[PDB]
Design a protein around this ligand. Structure first.
Ligand SMILES: NC(=O)c1cc([N+](=O)[O-])c(Cl)cc1NCc1cc(F)c(F)c(F)c1
Length: 294
């Protein structure tokens, strides 16, 4: 590394390999993501560079965009653990409700900030939510999707997770809205509560049908325009909706109410991050200290 000192290979994300590195100068520890191929659109580097200006306590800071030797590196502030690992570690006992609430509240603040600045995430999942010992949780990878449209997969044979994809994306809609992030966060909220993924689809159609089996096959009544979506087929089976009391037990009515608003089929009826923050579910929100083993 011309300037860094690779500590370890954290992983291999959807846009390239990730390393924990120490800036031999500043001495700071950061996450270095090497972006995928043989050109790199200058349009992307400009859009990405804009993301450097985004500053919010619940958004992982993009410290630098390095375009040298014709390669693309993203330098991010470092956090020791992601929500996926934390949920696994908390599987036996479950994440306490007060902490689930704190995390959801913080993530909505982060989304409200991004959305008011016209930035969408598009690929929220537990792995993209980072946490620290102080009880904070932050969104990682905001805006990278748009600055790269949709490259389908990661870069080198790796099963793309569809579990958190909004139905409008699954139905072929070409224009994503802020609502896709609320849907993903709703799925994550449910998973923290039940300790099981809400919609663990194994294919795009299995994903769509798992959603339909739980929330009911959508129709023009609940989702005006759904039958005209690019990938909608009149041959879709028609399943009846289940009750939330059965979907995320034993979550209370405040929680079920908020979740139901985050999972409305019509992107336009789906609650905004701003509005969700005012929901009664957050009346008693606090900021608990999580039990992190690093
Ligand atoms: N900003 C970041 O801090 C970070 C970034 C990316 N990434 O995509 O650019 C990834 Cl993957 C993991 C990250 N940390 C969480 C983490 C740190 C570890 F040190 C570790 F071992 C682990 F599993 C998870």
């Amino acid at each position: 590394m011309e300037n860094f000192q690779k500590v370890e290979k954290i992983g291999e994300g959807t846009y390239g390999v990730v390393y924990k590195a120490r800036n031999k100068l500043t001495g700071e520890v950061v996450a270095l993501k090497k972006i995928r191929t043989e050109g790199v659109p200058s349009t992307a580097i400009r859009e990405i560079s804009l993301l450097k200006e985004l500053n919010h306590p619940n958004i992982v800071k993009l410290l630098d965009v390095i375009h040298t030797e014709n390669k693309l590196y993203l330098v991010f502030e470092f956090l020791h653990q992601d929500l996926k690992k934390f949920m696994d570690a908390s599987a036996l006992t479950g994440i306490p409700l007060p902490l689930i609430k704190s995390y959801l509240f913080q993530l909505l603040q982060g989304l409200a900030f991004c959305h008011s600045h016209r930035v969408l995430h598009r690929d929220l999942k537990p792995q993209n939510l980072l946490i620290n010992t102080e009880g904070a949780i932050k969104l990682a990878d905001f805006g990278l999707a748009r600055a790269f449209g949709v490259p389908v997969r990661t870069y080198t044979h790796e099963v793309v997770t569809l579990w958190y994809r909004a139905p409008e994306i699954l139905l072929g809609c070409k224009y994503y809205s802020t609502a896709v992030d609320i849907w993903s966060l709703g799925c994550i909220f449910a998973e923290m509560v039940t300790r099981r993924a809400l919609f663990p689809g194994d294919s795009e159609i299995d994903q769509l049908f798992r959603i339909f089996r739980t929330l009911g096959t959508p129709d023009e009544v609940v989702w005006p325009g759904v039958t005209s979506m690019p990938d909608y087929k009149p041959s879709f089976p028609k399943w009846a909706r289940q009750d939330f009391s059965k979907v995320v037990p034993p979550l209370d009515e405040d929680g079920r109410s908020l979740l139901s608003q985050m999972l409305h089929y019509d992107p336009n009826k789906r609650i905004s991050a701003k509005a969700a923050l005012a929901h009664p579910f957050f009346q008693d929100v606090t900021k608990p200290v999580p039990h992190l083993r690093l």
